[PDB]
Structure 1
């Protein structure tokens, strides 16, 4: 007889009708992912558009209910998730043009070829073609061609399309009572309705900027060490005081520095930790791997897995009679169905991802009692952090020697832990300024603070100053470099990969402090201690029903984000870096370029 009751009944009928459609869509997609064929290629379209029509009528009907008359927080978070109009506010012609542009950019990106016409042998595919030409090559000009020609062709056809995209998305955003597309993309960290844990859209920039300044000296010493070590490979193309060129960072764009470890190893004679050479000889297959991985989760107090998990999960490659893409995901079909489909290989990398997907499924099964719309992580960075520490705590020599992956007496020396720490740092500390700078340029361009003539000037101006990377060749306005990335061409957001790295080390330091561990934070293991698991479970069960600030405080004890635990994790390597950086030069000059002659 009131607004809250009407919304409640509406949500009841939505809930008891959405699962029977989502499940059939999930089952059809599962069967297709098993069998790559043109026979069932349209079942994805059928399931998608059936559930899409359902959702669109539901969202259209959901707008007769205002948000000012609701007092229940649960119902408010439930209704606020259904009222998001999206792109339905635009006119029919505008929506058709928008969809045409969106399809065109993706088709150009996916069917885009880059080749050297003069030499026929200089032609190769993308994966494992043009992707590995940038991963295990030590040539300068050969890397430069692949760097330049990819953006001189694919990115030069996306510029007028991206300009139309910018104007159309700005028009879309300004009609949902928003300011810009950037404000649209910052709205998922926004928290309101609670006293003492509120968060605003304009405070994210302030917090990110505060953390960046604190991080800057550690990255500065790492940057100096890496630049000094890279001088041996490229002595005639770098200046000992300037910047680092963009086409030598280990991949196409520079998101990760991992592939540089083969050249920047501190102790090259010490045998690196290895488990691929043992897994082959240990008669180790997926069945035994999963049998072992269950025990670790039972040890700390987490429950057991179900019967259908073993039967319905596909593990090893089904030969060549059929195709399957297994890009890394675990599977939750709904209605109590948990399965897994992984690319099994005999390598170091696969024990860890078994534990990782195990943790994903554990998080899924933790909040299965929440209502239909609230079955998710606290924010877009929480789900990937809880699966990353399970791999951290299982690779330690304390644990491996008890399950035998390591030798019974694999010695621990300071010539091995430094190697492990630097391998960790190359992947984690080499990406934060990259994510920061990309999102900053995106925000400023969406706000209109950069006029068109400065689209490709300010990009390199911030690149050269914040992250210490310069370009090999000058680019005028006709280019579009940011659009050459997958997430940009498919309009995906990017700040989650910045926030999750902050969250995960806070979690690990809290857990290994509570587990009563004495020694360096990088030698810690929470197995055989149920207190750490019981502490993580209380956060895991919450789901989306609480703000993320409260979720963070319930485990660590602080409502904000901090870099002190990360700096403490890396302090043993920080001391070594400072000791090794006594005679070098620390800092970079912004007035240098490789083509300024």
Structure 2
């Protein structure tokens, strides 16, 4: 009966708001204030939101969704029938919740210490080492140290996490957790679709990789860089080698065309974390999109507390499920990398605000990729030399242009293989083809195969390098970032065309375009109410994911890399 189904969705929606709001409160409090106490209230509210999920979920499963005519209702009920962890028996649920908490806590409080010297946390200290040291041995100390302290300490938890997450997936009708994660795209051809996108980025990626390898060879010496082999994973300016723009100084295409020290510019001009968020807010409002509410400025944690409070530093954006309270929790350092991060997070806030009037079951991105893409799209415009000039962080030439595209490539292109491999690994862990006997080995096998990277120190038994990357102990799916990086360029392209830009796509800055804002807004308003091809069609006027926009953006760089690599005789790739 349609009327009983409609009443159920109404009752689900009012009751979810309340319970989700409380849960979000306690999680927030833990995340911003890791103590025995907040941890206990968190584990408590876990049981509460599960009891709600189990009640409504058991109700939802009694409806034959086949017989439902209204498609919105049908879709809400189908999703409520998935209980996630709340399908587990009470004992296993308690253990699962404890395992997650323990993994996240371990990661978030790990330090790496010099004997008789000072301890370094990941943010800011170890991050700053990976970004600015140009000494092999110091990079190595930070890279190995982090894996020794974060990664190896996660290993004790991960087999049990895999068992429980998979058990929950099976109890919701999936074959394993990885199947459940992939189902969020509602795209049976996902794996194939992503593989093809990955393959189209290989020319750019291999040419980038070879040119960076050459430059590393020049700086670190021939005894440390094989010009036909993988790059050591500690030399790319980032703990995970997932983005390479911190080694821009080593790889500048045109060192004659100098570029401002944007960090020193930000610092010298008294930028603060608050200023960084306010500029993102200005950009969203310039498009005719929504401002963040006053409450956001009062409640968000935009820098690392100095008061001895221990926190989850890893930046994140929060929906409190009442349509009024949205926040960001970021340990913001004043630099360009973090400004892009602030935009990314403000993009999530903007989405929470555009879909806040949907039923809570439909308050998500069209697919998780879309959620990740919004803030990045704006940041692409922010990053342009012309925009950075207007912010007084930079001072025509082909030389400055190739330099710019290189800077962008070191972020965008370098991330393509990393973002692809993380869930290639986890999918295989979840489906049981990687056991705990070879977690680490299979990880490095994909690091090699996709990114062309090798470990600077041979791994041993007891290593679990995956555990040294946040998303792994925190159980946050990763393929969304791969989708994001592809579709963000398609969105930029479409927004630029809508805004009347002509000329090379990389020169576009959509600041203040209402036409561009209006496309984003009508897509974000759909939330999860329709298949994601419809939101794609709304923004871009076609319904597929496609690498052609990102290739078009980087085409002048591709031509330059090819000429450069050919001139030097590079052999692209590695064995």
Q: How far is 1:370 from its partner? A: 1.9
- 1:323 and 1:74, CA in 2 relative to 1: closer, same or farther beyond 3 A? same
Moved more, 522-531 or 7-16: 522-531
2:225 aligns with 238
Match of 1:83 in 2: 81
Give the alignment of 1:245-260 within 5 angstroms: 245-260=232-247
> Higher mean Cα deviation, 555-564 or 145-154?
145-154
Match of 1:568 among 534, 552, 555: 552
Aligned with residue 569 of structure 2, among 557, 570, 584: 584
Q: Distance in 1 between matches of 2:445 and 2:266?
A: 49
How far is the alpha carbon of 1:356 from its aligned partner?
5.5
Over residues 59-86 of structure 1, what are the superposed CA-to-partner deviations in whole Å (9 max), with x where a residue is unaligned?
3333322322222210112112211133
Distance of 1:446 and 1:145 partners within structure 2: 32
SS at match of 1:513: helix
Go from structure 1 to structure 2 and tell me whether the alpha carbon gap of 1:222 and 1:10 turns closer, same or farther (over 3 Å shift): same
Could you tell me how far 1:10 is from its partner in structure 2?
1.8
Aligned mates of 1:280, 1:393 — CA distance in 2: 22
Deviations 1:343-371 (A, max 9, x none): 67765567666666655444333223322
What is residue 524 of structure 2 aligned with on the other side? 540
Aligned to 1:593: none
Aligned pairs for 1:169-208 within 5 A: 169-190=165-186, 199-200=187-188, 203-208=189-194
Query: 1:377 corresponds to which residue?
Result: 365
CA displacement at 1:495 relative to structure 2: 0.6
Aligned to 1:196: none
Q: Does 1:392 align with 2:380?
A: yes
> Could you say if the C-alpha distance between residues 518 and 87 of structure 1 is closer, same or farther in structure 2, counting changes exceeding 3 Å?
closer
CA separation of 1:452 and 1:36: change in aligned 2, threshold 3 A: closer
Q: Which stretch has the larger CA shift, 331-340 or 207-216?
A: 331-340
**Does the 8 A contact of 2:280 with 2:342 survive in 1?**
yes
Q: In the alignment, is the contact (CA less than 8 A) between 2:321 and 2:360 conserved in 1?
A: no
SS in 1 for 2:183: coil
1:174-213 residue CA offsets vs partner (Å, 9 max, x unmatched): 44332233222211112xxxxxxxx31xx22211221222
Given candidates 355, 361, 364, the residue that maps to 2:352 is 364
Q: Which structure has the highest helix share of the two?
A: 2
Does residue 8 (structure 1) correspond to residue 6 (structure 2)? The answer is yes
Question: 232-241 or 38-47, which moves further after superposition?
Answer: 38-47
Partner of 1:595: none
**Alignment CA distance shift 1:285-1:76 (3 Å):** same
Partner of residue 198 from structure 2, selected from 212, 215, 220 = 212
Q: In the alignment, is the contact (CA less than 8 A) between 2:152 and 2:467 conserved in 1?
A: no
When structure 1 is superposed on structure 2, of 492-501 and 232-241 the one drifting more is 232-241
Kindly state the Cα deviation for residue 310 of structure 1 after the two structures are TM-superposed. Answer: 8.5
The 1:541/1:445 distance shift into structure 2, 3 A limit, reads: closer
Seen in structure 2, the aligned counterparts of structure 1 residues 185 and 134 have a Cα distance that, compared at 3 Å, is same
Specify the alignment match of 1:18 in structure 2.
16
Change (3 A) 1:73 1:458: same
Change (3 A) 1:338 1:352: farther
Distance 1:458 1:231 in 2: 27
Over 3 Å counting, the alpha-carbon distance change for 1:500 and 1:179 in structure 2 is same
TM, length-normalised to structure 1: 0.81
Cα distance in 1, alignment partners of residues 372 and 200 from structure 2:
24
Q: CA deviation at 1:488?
A: 2.1
How many Å separate the matches in 1 of 2:497 and 2:229? 42
Alignment size in residue pairs: 571
Spell out the pairing of 1:408-423 with structure 2 (5 A cutoff): 410=395, 412-423=396-407
Instruction: Could you tell me which runs of 5 or more consecutive residues in structure 2 were left unpaired when the two chains were aligned.
Output: none
Deviation, 1:382, is 1.0
Change (3 A) 1:281 1:178: closer
For the 8 Å contact 2:205–2:413, the answer to whether it is kept is yes
Specify the alignment match of 2:509 in structure 1.
525
Structure 1 residue 514 displacement after superposition: 2.7
Say if 2:273 and 2:334, in contact at 8 Å, map to a contact too.
Answer: no
SS in 1 for 2:133: coil
| Cα pair distance change 1:397/1:55, threshold 3 Å | same
Q: 1:477 to 1:68 in 2, by over 3 A?
A: farther
Structure 1 counterpart of 2:419, from 435, 450, 463: 435
- Asked if the contact 1:35–1:324 (Cα under 8 Å) also holds between the matched residues in 2, the reply is yes
Contact 1:275–1:405 under 8 Å retained in 2: no
Residue 67 of structure 1: aligned partner: 65
| Residues 530-552 of structure 1: CA deviation (Å, up to 9, x unaligned) | 33333333212211111111211
Change (3 A) 1:369 1:272: same
**Is the Cα–Cα contact under 8 Å of residues 455 and 477 in structure 1 kept in the other structure?**
no
Pair 1:470-2:470 in alignment: no
Instruction: Describe the shift of the 1:40–1:275 C-alpha distance in structure 2 as closer, same or farther (beyond 3 A).
Output: same
- CA spacing shift, 1:86–1:113, aligned 2, 3 Å: same
- Does structure 2 retain, via aligned residues, the 8 Å contact 1:521–1:569? yes
Structure-2 separation of matches of 1:333 and 1:126: 28
In structure 2, the CA distance between the partners of 1:257 and 1:299, relative to structure 1 (3 Å rule), is closer
The alignment yields a C-alpha RMSD, in angstroms, of 3.9
Q: Larger deviation: 89-98 or 53-62?
A: 89-98
Distance 1:414 1:487 in 2: 39
Mark the structure with the bigger radius of gyration.
1
SS of structure 2 residue aligned to 1:488 = coil
Match of 2:392 in 1: 405
**How far is 1:373 from its partner?**
2.2
Work out whether residues 232 and 454 of structure 2, in 8 Å CA contact, stay in contact via their aligned partners in 1.
yes
1:222 aligns with 2:208: yes
- TM-superposed deviation, 1:414: 1.9
Distance 2:26 2:175 in 1: 40
| C-alpha separation in 1, matches of 2:109 and 2:284 | 43
Conservation of the 8 A alpha-carbon contact between 2:51 and 2:86: no
